[PDB]
Design a protein around this ligand. Structure first.
Ligand SMILES: *Cc1c(COP(=O)(O)O)cnc(C)c1O
Ligand SMILES: *Cc1c(COP(=O)(O)O)cnc(C)c1O
Lengths: 454, 455
């Protein structure tokens, strides 16, 4: 590879995602990643980087899976593409559907296929509203979400999400979406009793339901753990109370499993850790470990019963819905996870080990709080020990500084506000977990003098 | 494959797209497609079917490309995925970006990556509105489209599209989207002078611009040829007049190239056939010939200038934006098109031949009109020769009947209302074009007695 040419071509022809393109230009183009193996990334100048984010919350089985490349090759030779539009289907999405249904459990029996997690939430949006029309309750149209939630980057995905700065671009959210407080203990309930803060966050949902009018509410949607929002782990008892709220007013419960799904929290889906029974779930990312684009919506049997008994077209779907090659890779990816027991390993081995390893950072003068569940975790950066006070009293200044030192020291982790977030592949060893935490501590030590000088 | 078992699993676990699931259940599950080669499809019960729709307007290089399977395998070994979120990129999307920009021409210099054509229009929606905010014209928010347009299946894609029945599901369109008449001569301008009907269709866009308020309009979006709507080919002079309209009121011109792109109309992009210069285009389907999911938005240089000069995050993108394996396959797909010259072949050879072959159906008692451009075409079904009158005076009855007979006779074509539309892979031979048209005529002959017996 000609790295200088790829950087020039990047600026001249490529618009990266979630990027300030003035910043990209000022650094002379994007940083070129050329190869990867196991849990490590290699860039244009030869630097080995421990990928503490598994690509983008997705590469769960790790890099270097020749077995997955082979699965794609074989299916592309036999049948690279056909549609599911013409009363037709192909083997791979059908066999993958039965496998996903096995992992979803409960009444989640069917899947609708898309490509990205964002589309899956578009599918949730249209299917939920169509379902209530078939049920004879057409007034049920409003979706209730939370501030700092992330549900994708489509128009509907941004609307369902709670990123106010993301809402601005596109003049979003669209109508029929409401947002309430997030159960963020460290930021918004610091010093509150967890049970009392939880009740406040649950009550905010009920207040919104009553304001909208229960007969007008279609569903509540939420991530089991808010990933892109900074690993917001809700207090104990939050999700059971939210489910009871949904059942009380007869609204659907939707869990966005795009990040929490497929082993991230020690379960096949995040909602199973909390023992709740959603009516729909969105999934992607870890579905194929990012090896090929594919996503799906898990659909409850009683939703399918309306489609099967009332009839009528559900006028919804994408060209690549059920793509046989992407489906075959996702199927093999699940089989690799089953074979190697990566879901159980996260719950019983690496998850707890990550929790103890991150807890050793608690004594650092810059660390306000560490938290983790399975193989996702966050480290809070504070200017005053024992508080949630942030440097310059302006969240987002200290974060990037610590992040850049981690990257300089060979660890790819990201800063969400002043929270350093990690999300490594599920194959990470305990020694590599110690390496990850070691680099964070090393970067915090270096960050201390520059942060004090702000 | 255990076909009976797959049908069981299909009903028990799979929700197909654009489907009546009661109908699927009543037939005992979806029809299983197992393998394909060249332009032919094979199902569970052994039937060979000429794929007159190239999968779903997408399989342009045809089936059986081991070269594309190899390109995917090699890239997945070296680097299966990394993101473009962290000021990072990988070689394949960068190399694909330069190739696409070379084919787009004009001021279309940059691409933003997604997975589906629907997402591409979501990217158009947010980028156009963000662009006008950076330009200091925040009132420019409204998109103008057309009835019977198709722009995807996301909430924004359905909103931008003009399928009224699709709008109902989801209670769409969202605010800030207006729809005007489609330039459908056969259905809505039968007996009108084409130039006067064209002017009527262009004036409806201007009327909407003035109603919304020119300072409040962000862009006009349209397919060069309306694909899913039934191959609606606009009258001559329509698109040049539409471009002038956009330039007159200073609004952006967006062409949805997801179906028309990559050789379908004899050009790398449909708008190039009409000589117009859109500010943004959406592309997918033929981008990778459907071999892997990938899509892109072509972005004009002056749009990028706002991002580069004003700065600020464009808070938009997908996990698989710029997926290296999908990009490598799309790049190899374009190289196959270049090597085999399918773009020039469609413009000069197979495109005109399809028009000549379809024109032989003009003498059939059921055919009201045939039309085509490149390798997409439509055959109108009428109950009265020389009119646009439809069987039972209710569009959509005759269509499915002729379509089902085509499928029985070994040709996969679809009926849009009472229009039989074809869109075969670009590698189709002239003999296979004659086979396709022959099966259509055979099915029309068989359909004539049952259609005359309606009611
Ligand atoms: C990543 C993410 C999405 C969006 O998924 P894409 O494939 O990038 O469109 C949606 N919801 C959650 C919880 C996510 O983490
Ligand atoms: C196919 C189509 C779309 C939607 O593309 P998907 O990949 O199915 O989401 C958008 N616009 C046009 C013109 C199309 O033909």
């Amino acid at each position: 590879h000609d790295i200088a040419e790829l950087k020039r071509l990047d600026l001249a022809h490529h618009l990266p995602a979630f990027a300030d393109h003035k910043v990209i230009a000022e650094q002379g183009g994007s940083r070129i990643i050329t190869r990867a193996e196991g849990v490590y990334i290699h860039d244009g100048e030869g630097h080995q980087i421990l990928d503490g984010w598994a690509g983008l919350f997705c590469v769960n089985v790790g890099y270097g899976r020749e077995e997955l490349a082979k699965a794609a090759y074989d299916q592309m030779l036999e049948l690279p593409y056909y549609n599911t539009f013409f009363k037709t289907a192909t083997p791979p999405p059908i066999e993958l559907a039965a496998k996903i249904a096995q992992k979803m459990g409960g009444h989640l029996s069917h899947v609708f296929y898309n490509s990205s997690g964002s589309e899956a939430n578009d599918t949730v949006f249209r299917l939920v509203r169509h379902f209530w029309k078939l049920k004879g309750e057409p007034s049920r149209t409003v979706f209730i979400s939370r501030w700092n939630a992330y549900h994708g980057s489509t128009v509907a995905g941004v609307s369902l999400g709670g990123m106010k700065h993301m809402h601005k671009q596109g003049d979003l959210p669209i109508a029929g979406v409401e947002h309430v407080m997030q159960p963020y203990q460290f930021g918004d309930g610091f010093g509150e009793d967890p049970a009392a803060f939880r009740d406040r966050a649950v009550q905010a949902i009920e207040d919104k339901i009553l304001e909208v009018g229960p007969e007008n509410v279609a569903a509540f949607i939420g991530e089991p753990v808010q990933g892109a929002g900074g690993v917001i782990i809700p207090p104990d008892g939050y999700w059971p109370a939210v489910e009871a709220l949904c059942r009380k007013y007869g609204i659907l419960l939707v869990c966005d499993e795009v990040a929490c799904g497929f082993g991230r929290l020690g379960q096949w889906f995040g909602h199973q850790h909390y023992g709740i029974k959603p009516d729909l779930i969105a999934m992607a990312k870890g579905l194929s470990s990012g090896y090929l684009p594919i996503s799906a919506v898990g659909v409850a049997d009683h939703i399918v019963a309306e489609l099967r008994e009332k009839g009528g077209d559900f006028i919804h779907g994408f060209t690549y819905s059920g793509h046989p090659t992407a489906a075959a890779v996702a199927l093999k990816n699940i089989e690799i996870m089953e074979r190697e027991g990566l879901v159980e390993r996260t719950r019983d081995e690496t998850g707890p080990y990550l929790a103890q390893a991150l807890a050793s950072l608690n004594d650092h003068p810059l660390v306000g709080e560490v938290r983790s569940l399975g193989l996702i975790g966050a480290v809070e950066i504070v200017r005053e020990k024992g508080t949630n006070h942030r440097f310059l009293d302006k969240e987002g200044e200290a974060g990037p500084i610590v992040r850049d030192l981690c990257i300089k020291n060979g660890l790819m982790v990201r800063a969400i506000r002043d929270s350093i977030v990690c999300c490594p592949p599920l194959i990470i060893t305990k020694a590599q977990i110690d390496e990850l935490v070691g680099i964070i501590r090393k970067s915090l030590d270096e960050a201390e003098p520059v942060l004090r000088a702000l």
